[PDB]
Amino acid sequence: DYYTYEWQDIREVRANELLNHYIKEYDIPLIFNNGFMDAMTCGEEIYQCD
Amino acid sequence: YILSDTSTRVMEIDGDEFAEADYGLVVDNSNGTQELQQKLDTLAQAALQTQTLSFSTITKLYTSSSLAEKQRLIEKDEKQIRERQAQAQKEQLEAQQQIAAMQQQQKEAELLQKEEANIRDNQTKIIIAQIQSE
Amino acid sequence: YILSDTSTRVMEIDGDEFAEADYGLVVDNSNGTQELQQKLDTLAQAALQTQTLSFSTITKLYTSSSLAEKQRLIEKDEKQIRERQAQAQKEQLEAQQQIAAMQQQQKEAELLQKEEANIRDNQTKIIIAQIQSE
Ligand SMILES: [Mg+2]
């Protein structure tokens, strides 16, 4: 079934399987939610990805 | 564990150093991709009925989380069934034709029987004419 | 008592010293997994009617508590019906062929009888003319 797939498709599945996991693992929507409170208080909204 | 067999071998085909927005892939939460997601599941629900997508495929669509995998499953399951219906049309066509072949083979067998049935009456009429003439 | 026969056996594999989120499993109460539980239970009902899913398996889905268990159960019974509907079509396909097989040999038995019938009138006819010649 990967003969009907495309190269931009296999790169897109791998990108989502990385992103769908770690959003649910770290609970990233809460990390972005604390960052909005600094946005309304400083005017700054910064994150480090390490 | 979080990636597949084909997804882990992407690391070998070169250049993965380069950002994904250089290879045509962007992170997008916008009204275009929610409209494409709501279309692609409504299209699958319209394909679940009329027996175009199996119940194996639709549960893979609900647990996909990527608009291109769930696009390829609609494409893959349509090509499989439309191949199966085209060969089912073909096997039903040749079956009535071999039925048309076996009825034709027996009626010329009936036809060849009555002509060999007739001549052996005719040549034995020559025999019963022959014996008493002595 | 609270676990299955398979679920007590993953302890024998060398992985349960580590967290579950290292093997792709997280706890989730979101809009994502709540929509999946609706989409599996609605697809179960559309499979219950149109005779694709039995009443025994629907009772297993309601008391399943896992969104991947009831994914593997709807795919289980749908594979059970598609093999039965394929073999019953093939059993009906050979049944018309074997009736057509036995109707073929019986009319050839009507064919092979009348060629050996008429020659028997012929060979006794030669005995008639040979007796009168003496
Ligand atoms: Mg028990």
Curated annotation (Swiss-Prot), chain A:
| Subcellular location(s) of the protein | Virion
Give start-end of the signal peptide: none
> Which domain of life does the UniProt lineage start with?
Viruses
Subunit text: Homododecamer. Interacts with the Cargo protein 1. Interacts with the major capsid protein.
Its function? Forms the portal vertex of the capsid. Probably involved in head assembly, genome packaging, tail attachment, and genome ejection.
Please identify the protein, giving its name as recorded. Portal protein
- From which organism does this entry originate? Bacteroides phage crAss001 (Bacteroides phage PhiCrAss001)
